[PDB]
């Protein structure tokens, strides 16, 4: 869906490029055969899982992975993301240090 935080696709003063479409009576009659059909026509463009899948792609690791090796429980440092990034603005000197 076109999120309203995405700016609209417009520029005020571009010339529209010349579309050299086929023209004339002999060419409007050109037909595609009856079996030719878009490569996933009956598949829906999105499912209820699609919005979630799009979210996982930008998730923190491991959540941008759907598969992988297991790790030891000791290897997984549950809090390490917290001190890698800058200390929150209000934390005491005790905590900032």
């Amino acid at each position: 869906y076109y999120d309203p935080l995405i700016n609209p696709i417009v520029l005020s003063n571009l010339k529209a490029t010349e579309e050299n479409l086929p023209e004339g009576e002999e060419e409007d009659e050109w037909e595609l055969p009856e079996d030719v059909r878009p490569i996933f026509e009956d598949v829906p463009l999105y499912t209820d899982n699609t919005a979630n899948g799009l979210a996982l792609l930008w998730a923190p690791r491991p959540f941008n992975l759907r598969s992988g090796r297991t790790r030891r429980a000791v290897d997984v440092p549950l809090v390490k993301s917290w001190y890698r990034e800058h200390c929150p603005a209000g934390m005491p000197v005790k905590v900032r240090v």
């Binding site: 899948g53 930008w58 993301s81 990034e85």
Partner: protein
């Protein structure tokens, strides 16, 4: 299965009792991504 000892270890989602690999679905991973959210960073990229 969320609170088993070695969850899914016997199922198709992980290789077996040696517990060396896993392969989840998106309903699984997204439910887990939600439950982790209190621990996770909000950052979407390394530019920060």
């Amino acid at each position: 299965w969320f609170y088993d000892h070695k969850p899914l270890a016997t199922t198709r989602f992980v290789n077996g009792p040696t517990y060396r690999k896993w392969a989840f679905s998106i309903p699984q991973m997204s439910t887990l991504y939600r439950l982790a959210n209190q621990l996770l960073t909000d950052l979407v990229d390394d530019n920060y």
